[PDB]
Amino acid sequence: GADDDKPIQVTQMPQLAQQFIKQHFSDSKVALAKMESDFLYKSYEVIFTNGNKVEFDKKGNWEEVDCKHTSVPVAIIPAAIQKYVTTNYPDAKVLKIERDKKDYEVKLSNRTELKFDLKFNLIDIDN
Amino acid sequence: GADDDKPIQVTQMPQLAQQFIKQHFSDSKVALAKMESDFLYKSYEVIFTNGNKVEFDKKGNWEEVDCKHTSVPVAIIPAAIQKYVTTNYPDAKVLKIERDKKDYEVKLSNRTELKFDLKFNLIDIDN
Ligand SMILES: [Ca+2]
Ligand SMILES: [Ca+2]
Ligand SMILES: [Ca+2]
Ligand SMILES: [Ca+2]
Ligand SMILES: [Ca+2]
């Protein structure tokens, strides 16, 4: 829970996560890194000085990239999802992307939320 | 996709969905009901005249209750989740709840989003 939050240095994060930050957020500055946990999970969150955030699983694989203050770096977005978005919502940016073992969620700047299965088939549009 | 939306009467929705509306939204008025679909899914959405929405799977089982204009009827919220929310966020209402085959998402009026597994163990807090 919230009481279990533990601030850490970026160097205490999994190496996969450290690499991801360097790869995609080289131009951003880290405001706070923490380990988030409860009885049955552990994750890592990094918040940048512009308010954007990335959350990683215990292995350092991203699970949430929330760039609502700018937009999500395109390299992170699966090509089939980027094509769907740029075809059908050409005036929107992707503000957040999430993934788990079953789907991707994408939140657009026009407030639409899309969900895709792991084979990038559309399974929900919410406006 | 958006082009496939098909407006319908509420009586064309699965009976489980019709029952859910009557059970929990007796005081609301239906503005629009539709079948939503793409190649690999079908769902049903009902929007009320106050802007709240419920989405159901093809069988009429709710998957999203978005009551951001009021709050989610408490009877819909699993007891363990209601207890977590009312303990740790006593000033918040639940504005949306979602579920799938693996987790529940809950969005609170203070903008916090919580995720629980199907056994109601906390697996994410996002602020
Ligand atoms: Ca939908
Ligand atoms: Ca939905
Ligand atoms: Ca989800
Ligand atoms: Ca989190
Ligand atoms: Ca998260």
- Can you tell me the distance from the alpha carbon of B47 to that of B90, in angstroms, rounded to the nearest whole number? 28
d(CA A39, nearest CA chain B) in Å: 8
Sheet holding B113-117, edge to edge: B6-8, B30-38, B41-48, B53-56, B62-66, B94-99, B103-108, B113-117, B122-126
- Can you tell me the distance from the alpha carbon of A10 to that of A25, in angstroms, rounded to the nearest whole number? 13
Q: Are B85 and B106 in contact (CB under 8 A)?
A: yes
Q: Are B114 and B106 in contact (CB under 8 A)?
A: yes
What is the stated resolution of the deposited model, in angstroms? 1.4
Token representation of residue B6: 């098909």
Experimental method: X-ray
How many A from CA of A45 to the centre of ligand 4? 7
d(CA A88, nearest CA chain B) in Å: 9
Q: Are A102 and A108 in contact (CB under 8 A)?
A: no
Token representation of residue B19: 């029952």
Q: How far is CA A79 from CA A19, A36, A76, A82, in A?
A: 21, 30, 9, 5
Q: Which of A3, A32, A45, A124 to mutate to test the interface with B (most CBs of B within 10 A)?
A: A124
Residue written as token pair 């992707």: A94
Which residues of chain B are within 8 Å of residue A88 when distances are taken between CB atoms? 1-2
- Can you tell me the distance from the alpha carbon of A29 to that of B122, in angstroms, rounded to the nearest whole number? 30
Q: Are B46 and B54 in contact (CB under 8 A)?
A: yes
Which residues of chain B are within 8 Å of residue A39 when distances are taken between CB atoms? 121-122
Confirm or reject CATH 3.40.1420.30 for domain A1-127, answering yes or no: yes
Residue A63: name the closest of A41, A82, A83, A88 by CA. Answer: A41
How many A from CA of B15 to the centre of ligand 5? 35
- The answer on whether A98 is annotated among ligand-binding residues is no
Q: Give the residue ranges of DSSP H helices in chain A.
A: 15-24, 79-88
Provide the Cα torsion B85, B88, B93, B99; round to 10°. -30
Provide the Cα torsion A20, A106, B18, B52; round to 10°. 110
